[PDB]
Each structure stands twice: as C-alpha cells, then as structure tokens.
Amino acid sequence: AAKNVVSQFVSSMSASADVLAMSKIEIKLSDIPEGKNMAFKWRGKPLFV
Amino acid sequence: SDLELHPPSYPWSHRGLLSSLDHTSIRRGFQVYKQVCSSCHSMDYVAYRHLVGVCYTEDEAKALAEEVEVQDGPNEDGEMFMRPGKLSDYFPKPYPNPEAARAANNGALPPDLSYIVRARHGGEDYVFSLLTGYCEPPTGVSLREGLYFNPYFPGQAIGMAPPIYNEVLEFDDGTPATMSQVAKDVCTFLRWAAEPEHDHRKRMGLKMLLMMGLLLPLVYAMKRHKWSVLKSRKLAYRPPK
Amino acid sequence: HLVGVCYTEDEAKALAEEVEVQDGPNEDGEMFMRPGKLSDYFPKPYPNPEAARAANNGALPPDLSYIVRARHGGEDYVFSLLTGYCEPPTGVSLRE
Amino acid sequence: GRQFGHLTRVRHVITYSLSPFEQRAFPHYFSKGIPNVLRRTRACILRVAPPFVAFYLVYTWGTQEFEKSKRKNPAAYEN
Amino acid sequence: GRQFGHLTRVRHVITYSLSPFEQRAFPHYFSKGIPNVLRRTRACILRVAPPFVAFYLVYTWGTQEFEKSKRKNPAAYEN
Amino acid sequence: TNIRKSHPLMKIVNNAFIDLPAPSNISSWWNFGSLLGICLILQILTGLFLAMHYTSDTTTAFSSVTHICRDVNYGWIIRYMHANGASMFFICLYMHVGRGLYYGSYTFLETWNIGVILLLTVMATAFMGYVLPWGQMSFWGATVITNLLSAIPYIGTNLVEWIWGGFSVDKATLTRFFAFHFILPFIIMAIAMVHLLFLHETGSNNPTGISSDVDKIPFHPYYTIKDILGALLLILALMLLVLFAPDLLGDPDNYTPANPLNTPPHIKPEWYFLFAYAILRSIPNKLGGVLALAFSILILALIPLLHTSKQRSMMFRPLSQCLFWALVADLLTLTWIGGQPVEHPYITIGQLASVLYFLLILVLMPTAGTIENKLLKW
Amino acid sequence: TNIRKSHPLMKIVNNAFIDLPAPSNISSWWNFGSLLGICLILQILTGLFLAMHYTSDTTTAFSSVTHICRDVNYGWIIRYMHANGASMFFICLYMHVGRGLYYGSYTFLETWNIGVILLLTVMATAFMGYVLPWGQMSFWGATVITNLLSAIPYIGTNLVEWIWGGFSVDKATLTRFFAFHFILPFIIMAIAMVHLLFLHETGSNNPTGISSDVDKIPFHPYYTIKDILGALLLILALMLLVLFAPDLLGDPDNYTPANPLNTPPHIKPEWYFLFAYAILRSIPNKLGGVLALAFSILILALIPLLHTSKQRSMMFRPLSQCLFWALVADLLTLTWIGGQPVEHPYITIGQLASVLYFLLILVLMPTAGTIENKLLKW
Amino acid sequence: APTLTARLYSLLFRRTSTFALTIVVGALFFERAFDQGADAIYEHINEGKLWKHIKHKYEN
Amino acid sequence: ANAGDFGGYYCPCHGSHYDASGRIRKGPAPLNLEVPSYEFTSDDMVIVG
Ligand code: HEM
Ligand code: HEM
Ligand code: HEM
Ligand code: HEM
Ligand code: HEM
Ligand SMILES: CCCCCC[C@H]1C(=O)O[C@H](C)[C@H](NC(=O)c2cccc(NC=O)c2O)C(=O)O[C@@H](C)[C@@H]1OC(=O)C(C)C
Ligand SMILES: CCCCCC[C@H]1C(=O)O[C@H](C)[C@H](NC(=O)c2cccc(NC=O)c2O)C(=O)O[C@@H](C)[C@@H]1OC(=O)C(C)C
C-alpha cells in the first residue's frame, strides 16, 4: 500500500496527460534564402532549418 | 410549480458496488451526443483522446476528430484558419457567446454536458427519466410558447424540445435505436463524461477492501499481543498485618 | 491612470472617447463598439503578435509600458535611440 | 512533563504478568466476548438510546407534515 | 540550556559598576572614539586590505583587456 | 548512556510517544487526537499536490480542478481524498470535543482552550477551502456566510467589503481565500503543538476521571500500536468515501460554475456547519442571528465555568449521562433542520432545538450536576 | 513566584531572549542571526500579501505582478520590499556564514549543520521565488539551472522532466514552483528553531573563541536592545533599496514576458548565485561543472573536519586571517566573473578563482593553521 | 520434523537482517500475485471492458 | 545563429560553440545538437517528425 499511494503521488507531477501534444510540421524551403537560419516552433521547442 | 417528483432506480450496469461501465454502451452514447445533443449542448471538458482508452481505438478517434473543423492558432499574418481535427482538443461546439444559446433556443441555456450526472440530484436517473419521461400537460396548466411539459423537472416548465424518438442510428453491428435504448446509452456515456475515473476507482476500491481484509485483522492481532501482558495481569494487595 | 497624473476628470473621459473599443457581447452574442470609458487601457495596434510582423517587416515594436525598466540605461537609451539616429559609414550594408 | 519514578507513592501491591509469546492474543474471544458487550450495552441502553428515538420520532413526523402541508394543501378549494 | 548559577566557578573578583542614570551614554565619544578606531584600523589593515586591492587590480585589468581584445581587435588587416 | 534520552531532539520524541506515561486505562475515545493529527498532515499533504495544479483566477478556478480530476495522473484520488479527508477532519474534531465533555477533560483549561482555538481555525480554514473550486455553493456559500460581519453595528459594512476586496465576491476574493487556505493549516499545526505542550503538563485524563498515576503504562508498545490500528480504521473510512461514494457528503451543484445572477433556492454550508446554520436563522434577527451563531461555538470556552459536579467524568453520572445524549441527538437535530428549507414544521422545531441547545448546556447539565452531588450526600 | 519562569510557554520565551546568559563580549557580527530571523518573517509577511493578488497560470503570471505594482493599493512597496528583502536575506546569510568561519563557530557541529540545511533551503526557495513573475530571466533562469540535474548519470533526464511536468518549462512548472515557494519558508522556519534549539545547548561563541562562562550577561537589556538598533539598521538598508533604488540589484529583463523562442545572450542567475555560476562554467564538463557547483556549497559541511588550529577564533591568527580575506575577495571575484560573458580574460581568471577557492579552503587554511600551532610551540 | 513456523523462525525471522530481507523479498512477489488475482477477480465479475472489445478492431 | 568561433551556433549560457553542422567544438556541451527525424517530399518542401 505504501508503494502504491506514494507512486500515485509521484506520478501526479510527472507529465499531465494533456501536456503531451505535438507531432509533424511542414516547412517551405524557398522561403529560407542562402545563409539564413530559420527557427520555427516544434514540440514546444525551437527547430532550426 | 412548487410540487415535484423524484426518479426511480433504473438498475444501471454500474449501480452495483464494484460495477464497471458498459463500454459498448458508452460508445452508442457518444453517438447520441454527436448527432443529437452536440448542436445545443456544450461539452467543454471531454476530448477525442479521452475516448481513446474507453470506447474507440487509436485510428478511430483520429477519424471522428477529423469530422469537424476547429479554429486553430494564428499564422504569420495573424490568420486563424480551420483544420481537419486532431485528437488534442475537446468538444467546444454550439455557440460562442452564452447569450447566443439564448438567442437560438428561446431564452434557455442548454448547460454543459460534462457536468450533468453529478450536477443534478438523482444523477443518471434524473436525466434518464427527464428524457424518457416527457409527458402531456393535464388540466389547470398553461405553457407559454413551446415551454414543453416534463414532470421530472423543477416547475414542470422546461424550454428544451424532446429530441428523443427521432430515430437516428449507427449502432454498428446492429442495435435498435428505440427511445429507451437511446436514453440509456446517452446517460451511460454521460456518466462516463462526468466521472471517467469511475471504473479504476472501483477497481482500486476492490483492492482497498481486499487489502484491509488482510490488514485490519493483522494490525489488530498485533495490538492484542502487546496488550495481552496488560490484559491478563494479576493484582494482589498485601498490606502489613 | 492619467487622471491624477497629468490630465483631469473630464479631460480623461474625452481622450478615452476618441477611439472605439470592442465592448462585451449583447443578448444575441454581439460585440459592438462604444465611445470610450476611462476603465480600459490602451490595447491598440495589432491583434495577433505576428500581425505586427506582417506590417513592420518582420519586426516587433515591443510594449511601451515596459521600456524604461526593460532596457539598460533606461530613459537615456530610449532618449538616445530616438534622437540618436545617424548615417551608416563605410564597410556596412543594410537589407531593405 | 512527568516521568516514571516521579509519579506517585505506592504501598503494597504485587503484580503478576505474563509474556505475550506465552499466552493467547484472543483468549476466549467469542465465548467471553459477546456476553460482555451484551452486558455493557444493557448497562447503557437507557441513557444513550432514549434521546435518539426522540430525534427519530421528530424526524419522521417532521418530514411527514412537511409534505402533507403543501402537497396535501389542496385539499379543498370548492366553488 | 544553561542558567546563571550553574555556569562556572569564580574565585576572587570584585566588580564595581554604576547606574546608567548616573553616568554618560557617550563619555568621550569623539575625544577617545576616533583615536581608537584609527588604532583598530591600523591593527588590521594589513590582513584585510591586501586581498581586496589584489581583486581591485585584477578587476580593472580584466575589463581593460576585455575591450582591448575585441574593440582593439582591428587593429590591422592590411592587403 | 541511552542517547534516546539525552539528545536535544529525541527528548521531545521520547516525551511525545515513547516514554510518556499514559493511563493503562484509556479507550477508543482517545484515538481522535492521533486521527486529528493524521488528518492535519494528510490534509496538508494532498492539499499541497492539488496546489501544484490548481490556480485561483475566477476564469480558470473551476477549470483547473476538472483538469486535475481528468487530466492530472491520479489527480482524482488526490482531489477526492482532500475533499473527503476534510469531512473526516470534522467527524474527528466532533468526536474529540465529544469525548472531552463527557469525560470532563475540559478541566485542563489551557489545553481545552487551545483546542477551541484549534476548532475555530480548522473551521475558518475549511470554509475558505470550499470557496476554491468556484462552484455555485462556493460563491453563495462564500456570500451567505462572510456577509454576517455586516450585522456588526456601525462597521459591519466596512469589514465585509474589506474581506471581499470589492463590493461583492470576485477577483480579490478567490486569490485571498486560496492564500489564507494555504497558510492557515501551518499556523494550526503550530497551535496544535502548544495544545500538546500544555497537555503533557498534566498527562491524560481517563474514562473514570479518577487519576491513573497509580497505574500508568508507557506509550511505547501500548499506545503507539493502538494508534496505528486506529489510524488504519481512519483510512478505511476515508477510502470508503473516496473509492466508493466520492460525492455522498458533497453538495452536487458546487459542480456547475459560479454566477452572481443565480442562487439556487436550497444552499446550505457543508454538512459540518448545519447545526450552526440552523441556529442562526432560527432567529428573526440580523444581529441576533449572528450573535447566536457565535455563542453556538464560543460556548465551549464557557463549559468549565459551569462544572458543578464533584466527580470529573460522567462515567458514574446517569442524570448527566442523559442530558449528554440529549445534547448529541439535539445536535443531530440541528444538523438535519439546517439541511432543510426554511418552511413549516422545520422552522418551529429548529427554533426549539436551538433553545434546547443553549438551555441544556447553560442550565440543565449544571443542574443535573448539583442534584447528583446532593444524591450522593456530597 | 515569578510566572515568567514556571509557565510552559514563557519558559521558552525566557530561554530565548530574556534570561539566557550571553557573552558580554559579542559584537556586531552576531546580529545577523536576528536579521535572518527578521528577514524570514518579513519575507513571509510581504510574500503572503503578494499571494492575495498573484496568480500562477503562465497567461496571467506577469500580468498579475504588474496589476499589483500599478493597481493594488500600495502593492508596489510590498512587491519591492519582498524582492529587495530577498537580497538582504542573502547579504545576511552571507555575512552569518562569514562570521561563522572566521570565529570558529562551526565547532558546534549540529548547529552549523542545521545552518547549512538552512542555507540550501533559502537558496532553493529564492530560486523558485524569481521564476514566479514569469519574466525572461525567470524562464531561462528556471531553465539553465534546473537542467543541471540532467547531468546526473543514467537518470538525469527523467528527474529534470519530472520536476518540469512536461518536456520543457511551462504550465506544470509555474504552479509547482509557486506552491513550493509557499511551503518552503514555513519548513525553513521550523528548521530554524531546531537550529536555535541546538544552539542553546552550548550558548554562543564569541570574538575570542575562549569561553565566556566566566563573564556572561543576561540577554535582558543588553542583546534585546542591541538587536533592535541592529534591526533598525536592516530596515534602513532594505528601505534604501525599495524607496530609492528599487531595481539596482534586479536584472532589467525579467520585465518583458517569457518566450521559449528567445534567450538573451547574457542571462545569469540573481547576484547571489554568481560565485556559484562562475564555478560551474569554469569547467568544460556537464558532469564536472555541476559536480563542482555542488561541492561549492556542500563544502561548508566539510570545514569542521579540517580544523587544524589549537585556537578556536581567528582573532589571534594573522596567517589564517590573511587567507580568510583572500577567500572573501576571491568570492567577490567569482561574483564579478559570474556576472560577465564567457569570453577572453574573464574565462581564465574565473577558472583560476575556482581552483583558488577549493585549494584555499581544502589546503591553504588547514595548513596556515598547523604552521601557527608550530609557531606558538603548540 | 519440527514445525513450519519453527523452521521459518530459525532460518529467517530470528535475525532482523533476514527478517527484513524476507519481507522485501516477500513484498515483491506479493504485489505481483495480488495484482493478478485481484484484477482477474475484477474482470470475471465484469466483461463490458475494452479488452473483449478489441477483437473487433485490429485493422484501423 | 551565426555566432561563435565556428560560424554555426553559440550557446550563451555557459559558452558552447557549435559549427554549421551543429557539432560541438568548444565549451561544456557533451554532444552534437539533435538532428530530428526528417525527409524531403519535394524540391521546395521538407516535413519534420
Ligand atoms: C439527448 C440529447 C440531450 C440531452 C441528454 C439533453 C439533456 C438536458 C438536461 C439534463 C438539461 C437540464 C435539466 C435540468 O435543468 O434539470 C437540458 C436543458 C436544455 N437543453 Fe437539452 N438535452 C439534449 C438535446 C437538446 C436539444 C436538441 C436541445 C434543442 C431543443 C436542447 C435545448 C435545451 C434547452 C433549451 C434546455 C433548457 C431547459 C431549461 O433549463 O429550461 N437540448 N438538457
Ligand atoms: C487541530 C485539532 C486538534 C488536534 C490535532 C488535537 C490533538 C490532540 C491530541 C493528540 C490529544 C491527546 C490524545 C487524545 O486525548 O485524544 C488531545 C487531547 C485533548 N484535546 Fe485536542 N486536538 C484538536 C482539537 C481539540 C479540540 C477541538 C479540543 C476541545 C475544544 C481540544 C481540547 C483537548 C483536550 C481537553 C484534550 C485532553 C483529552 C483528555 O485528556 O482526555 N483539542 N488533542
Ligand atoms: C496547507 C495544505 C492545504 C493546501 C495546500 C490546500 C490547498 C487546496 C486547494 C488548492 C484546493 C482546491 C482544489 C480542490 O478543491 O480540490 C483545496 C480544496 C479544499 N481543501 Fe484544502 N488545502 C490545505 C489544507 C486543508 C485543510 C487544513 C483543510 C480543512 C480540512 C482543507 C479542506 C479543503 C476543502 C474543504 C476544500 C474545498 C472542498 C472541495 O474540494 O470540494 N484543506 N485545498
Ligand atoms: C534560516 C537562516 C538562519 C537563521 C534564521 C539563523 C538564525 C541564527 C541565530 C538567531 C543565531 C544566534 C545569533 C547569532 O549568532 O548571530 C545563529 C548562530 C549560528 N548559526 Fe545560524 N542562522 C541561519 C543560517 C545559518 C547558516 C547559513 C549557518 C552556517 C551554515 C548557520 C550556523 C550557525 C552557527 C554555527 C551559529 C553560531 C554562531 C556563534 O555562536 O557565534 N546558521 N543563527
Ligand atoms: C511563504 C512566504 C512567501 C510567500 C507567500 C511568497 C509568495 C511570493 C509570490 C506570490 C511572488 C511573486 C510576486 C512577486 O514576484 O513580487 C514572490 C516573488 C519572490 N519572493 Fe517570495 N514568497 C514567500 C517567502 C519568500 C522567501 C522565503 C523568499 C526568499 C528570500 C522569497 C524570495 C522571493 C523572490 C526571490 C521572489 C521573486 C523575485 C522578484 O520579485 O523579482 N519569498 N513570492
Ligand atoms: C509527524 C509524526 C510524529 C508525531 C509527532 C506529532 C504528534 C504527536 O505528538 O504524537 C503523539 C502520538 C501525540 N499524542 C497522541 O497521539 C496520543 C496521546 C494519548 C493517547 C493516544 N492514543 C490512545 O490513547 C494518543 O494517540 C499525537 O498524536 O499528537 C499529534 C496531533 C501530534 O502531531 C502534531 O503535533 C502535528 C502538529 C505534526
Ligand atoms: C517572533 C519573534 C520572537 C522571537 C523568537 C524567535 C527568534 C528567537 O529565538 O529570538 C532570539 C532573539 C534568537 N537569538 C538571537 O537573536 C540572538 C542570540 C545571540 C546574540 C544576538 N544578538 C547580538 O549578540 C541575538 O540576537 C533569534 O533572533 O532567533 C530568531 C531567528 C528566532 O526567530 C525564529 O526562530 C523564527 C523561526 C520565528
């Protein structure tokens, strides 16, 4: 019983079943000219193309 | 109007102590929600993903999510277009402003459905009875426009049209969409839309009883042991002379 | 906020009335427009933040309430940045 | 605070006791148990029970009259 | 915890003292004050001050070289 | 030498539940002190885990709780243990005070008094507690109550708006209450220790009110294990609710968000204030109603001044034993009435129960005491 | 009989600051214990008033603080006293630990150790504190730091995401931190009392490290008033900031909300972590950097094991007296470097200062001690 | 041939080491077997699961 | 983007220098920046995830 209640309490901070979103993004290459670093938002984190 | 009546005890498949919900019946219920209620009843808290473990499956959830078009995040020009349907977002549907619910249904608020089974006394049965209840006004009486009649209702003067028997379907494999079959299913789903944890709760509850069933006696036999020294202690008083 | 500071009662009302903000929805779920109160702030230029980028070419003119405490030097950096404006010497470039 | 050794004065009393590992934790659990709780219940029914049935009587009659006050209300209104 | 009366043992020492309402709170505040803080400062400059000027020297030289490393950078690039 | 006795820290722990001499004599009615302790920590403990997910802001208040119940891994058990533990904390608080009167424990003035301070604070806490989810009961519960201070002559108005942060309950009121609902249980926890400090000065009273110095047993084995079993029982109950009947003691309408426009003809504070509720409105007065509501609880601090009997416990006092139960049942009455609408039978009977309450504690029990003295020839 | 001595409560108060015998001898370096106390309560006190207006929720976080500063009657002084009191709480914490080493106070193991526990906790608290307004520094401050646990072999990743509530800093992270920033100062406050409990076991050390039993004075008059004056001085300083230079010690860019897209090439934790910051990055290692950062503070708990001198205070120890100041200045160095970008001079010098720090405390001071012994013929 | 409880005491309960070792070793196997039998009991009395519902949707 | 000794990237928090390939060359960073799962669906489009 100590295991379980403690585990359940541990898991309630872990990652809310809702905060799990974000998958595939599509970027047009002709919009990024030679020599430039373009940043987008992907999975809540910066993605550089 | 001042007098009232309360619901009976429909023997739900989840009324018993350790009783799970009928997942097949939660399914048909969502259907009843989507085709019928969804065009008047907001359900701000449930989502397509919430349905994933419960009734439907992975791909199925995606598909049902795609059958609408929600206003996604703004884009570069500050747009806010439309998109197929994810899994992520919920069922925010019928009206924007709350008063726009009043502008449609004459001055009446069809309240959120996530609520329901736990926001009304009697729970499922009150909604079951309120739906399959629908009867006809006897003498005395009145009504304004179509402030329909319902006994299982505070005052008896609702503003909700009885969208029950309009036999809509898609009960895959084969299920007669009769009034009563349709009402049990909505409720059964509405139970789950209010208390999703419902089945786990009782699964644990079983273990809780089963655990305490070993522990209570044991942690009690332990206390006996230690107190037994005191319980069988013998006194003698031996004064001088 | 301007009432005690610079302007006066009636004056504040008047300056507030010289715009038209989107007030609360009404019975039909409207959201009309109205003169100007005193109550609300100065939420102005653009709705979406990227709409600031669509106008001024890819640049965010940041909130002004910030400013004097969000930039090192405070007033002087903004004073200098405004009255500073000079011309590019050799080397150099510029896009548009 | 008060410790053993400084509590109070005791004259001539012997106390025999026995190891827990040498006796039963539930001597005559039911044999002597039930009779005793009957005895303690009996010993106290009369001071505990009465006020509760009084509440009990007032509770059932109270709701009764509450329904029969309105529902029963009509009643007669004849003309 | 430890109370007066149970602290330690003291032999033969007399202590004369005077009521605060009978003396000055600032006897010779400046007359005797300044000379003493000079005396305590003197007594300690050499152990406190040195590490701080060392930091002081390293701080000014450190920023110096930081600007003269980049700004000064060009410098020469002649062709 | 035994470090368990000379180490500044252990001392305290040795004195608390190891070497402390206790009556070989106490019975189950003495468990509610551990249970209240347990309650206090478990409440503090689930309460905290809810705070890592809760919000405040009237817009998100309700939304966050549902977020927890549905989205937060296991958020539901936590939320429901918190809400159900809150009720249990009252059942015990109630039982504790009960044990107290019956057995004459109140003769330890300081201890009893700290306990009254402990009562008002957990009441004040639990009140703020239910305003948080921002439900219907939360809004008018938070309104019907708070207002009462508006009955205070000359300044009532000022205070009620000062506690409000506006002219009604909104923005300023939810954040306020959350913060207070957060800091109070810590303060309570301190007060508890002082309560317990003063208790150790005399040791515990017992079922006979006699004096057990002649027969004390070590807290070691005995009351530690009899506290463990006990706590297991408290867990059974708390879990029975949470896992089988989560909303049995909860008003179903604190679901459905707030609405300063509505007010659902019914509305009563959580069960544990019903007896008090009944008292207040069983008086046709703004000032009198609230004045009477206060006396309803602040009278505990009066009890010791009306001890009249030559014996301490009621163990050997049939007359008072009867008036004790009449008090309990009568409180069960007030609870029931409090739960009903202000209509026909219900009014006059709840009006009688109120008078009874005050007449019983203020005249009947004190007299029962004197007659018993006279009967015994004391 | 004097109730001030036999009443269970007063005893404690008599023992705390009335009858407690103290050295006739202590000087200003002993005031920071009251100041830390004062700091702790004032922090708890303004902190609470901010909580009746603050929020959490990433959307409203920043907005609420400004709301307070502009809209809330007097919210500005409260907000700024809180933020400035936080710095003062470090100045004192710093001075306290300083006083401690110099004078050898650390010989009271339990007391010293509780004090280290007191250090980490207020550090852990103040860290969470600045994440709250949800500014730029708040976001990456909350990011650059927390991450460090990702350097822990095999499980680093798991923990950093567990403390996060997601895969980055957001929703789950602000509410969490607020709640922890709320419960910690209470827990600290408890620990403080235990700190103080163990301190009363020996009484106070003094400028000579000798032993004042031969000349103790009552806390009554003496140290109560010398604590009052002292506290007034602490008020002067705290008010000087708040009322004349509110943002002098505050990073101007915690203004302007968050933005997981940005990161403004500069970013350093609040001043009081600079020395630590410098240490960590003055090491080309993820594991080593954080390992070294830990040792940077956890070394205090090592100091007593390297007391080598036959005298307790450094009052009569020129050699060590020199290495003490070299330590302080060197910490002032680390603070300065920490405040600079990881570029040319700044790198190598902050790299030297780090080595110095550890070599000074671990080799230099312990040797200075032994040589002094030898010089005295001890 | 002594007793089960006797032999049990000698080899595992006597020393607080083995005593504790026994319970951590005994808790692991208990959590597993109690969770099996329990859930099984929970299912057997039910059957409107999402377990027996899957057979229908292996496709998409 | 475009800062540091290697004309690629510079992380200002503790001084990590990366090249135009995203590889670590100076500073405390233990590994190269992560290359996400990606493919080109055409000459103008790239889909990440
Ligand atoms: C099976 C689908 C539906 C269900 C289960 C459902 C159930 C409910 C329930 C339980 C209430 C509140 C009862 C109470 O206050 O005690 C309600 C209110 C209402 N709903 Fe529905 N309804 C459904 C479909 C509709 C439809 C199609 C309409 C459009 C006519 C509608 C318009 C209303 C209105 C106007 C009210 C207001 C009644 C009142 O408060 O006066 N709902 N509904
Ligand atoms: C924060 C809530 C409270 C806690 C945590 C608490 C804790 C305790 C504990 C641990 C005991 C000793 C064990 C026992 O006798 O059961 C006790 C006894 C007592 N408490 Fe409380 N109690 C609380 C509320 C009260 C209340 C409401 C009262 C009465 C207003 C009260 C007055 C007493 C008295 C008089 C005793 C002595 C009991 C006896 O000797 O038989 N305390 N309490
Ligand atoms: C300091 C530890 C505590 C914290 C951090 C805490 C925090 C919270 C929070 C955030 C909520 C709203 C979430 C929810 O409603 O489930 C809440 C609800 C509540 N808690 Fe606490 N609280 C604490 C101690 C207490 C105490 C001492 C009591 C009194 C037994 C208490 C009784 C309540 C009540 C009555 C509610 C609202 C009832 C309900 O959930 O429906 N909690 N608490
Ligand atoms: C919560 C923060 C702290 C508080 C509230 C606190 C409070 C106090 C107080 C009131 C005193 C007695 C007065 C004085 O000597 O100044 C004291 C002395 C002491 N503290 Fe702390 N302190 C705290 C942090 C520390 C730290 C950081 C340390 C060292 C890690 C520490 C170890 C000591 C020691 C060893 C003493 C004895 C001083 C002496 O005898 O000369 N405590 N503290
Ligand atoms: C339990 C009493 C405390 C409460 C209720 C409290 C609550 C808060 C709240 C709501 C904020 C955000 C509002 C603002 O930033 O001005 C805040 C900021 C902060 N407080 Fe606390 N806190 C408390 C004790 C502390 C302690 C012990 C410290 C450590 C000295 C502390 C240092 C901070 C810091 C550093 C900040 C953010 C810095 C800033 O304002 O820019 N507070 N606190
Ligand atoms: C953290 C747990 C360690 C325990 C120390 C604190 C807890 C504490 O002090 O422990 C002892 C156990 C204290 N007394 C009793 O329990 C007790 C006393 C007489 C009889 C019985 N039982 C049956 O006859 C008892 O159970 C008691 O139960 O008080 C709690 C309220 C307090 O709890 C508190 O303070 C809170 C403020 C923490
Ligand atoms: C509420 C105010 C009443 C005071 C009781 C609590 C406070 C308390 O215990 O008071 C005494 C005053 C305690 N010691 C000293 O001050 C002190 C001791 C030796 C010398 C000096 N000064 C100059 O030589 C001192 O000032 C001290 O200062 O500790 C504080 C941290 C503690 O504060 C705390 O615990 C907090 C946990 C409350």
CSV table of C-alpha atoms in Angstrom, one decimal, chain C residues 1 41 60 65-66 69-72, chain G residues 70-71 80 247 252-253 255-257:
chain,number,residue,atom,x,y,z
C,1,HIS,CA,-4.1,56.1,-14.7
C,41,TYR,CA,-6.4,50.6,-21.3
C,60,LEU,CA,8.2,43.5,-33.1
C,65,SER,CA,4.7,50.2,-20.5
C,66,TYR,CA,7.9,48.1,-20.3
C,69,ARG,CA,12.9,49.4,-17.0
C,70,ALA,CA,13.4,46.7,-19.6
C,71,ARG,CA,16.4,48.3,-21.4
C,72,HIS,CA,19.8,49.1,-19.8
G,70,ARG,CA,0.1,49.6,-10.5
G,71,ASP,CA,-3.4,48.8,-9.4
G,80,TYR,CA,9.6,45.7,-3.9
G,247,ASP,CA,16.0,47.7,-9.4
G,252,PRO,CA,16.1,44.5,-16.0
G,253,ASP,CA,14.7,42.0,-18.5
G,255,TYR,CA,10.5,42.6,-17.2
G,256,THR,CA,9.3,41.7,-20.7
G,257,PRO,CA,7.4,38.3,-20.5
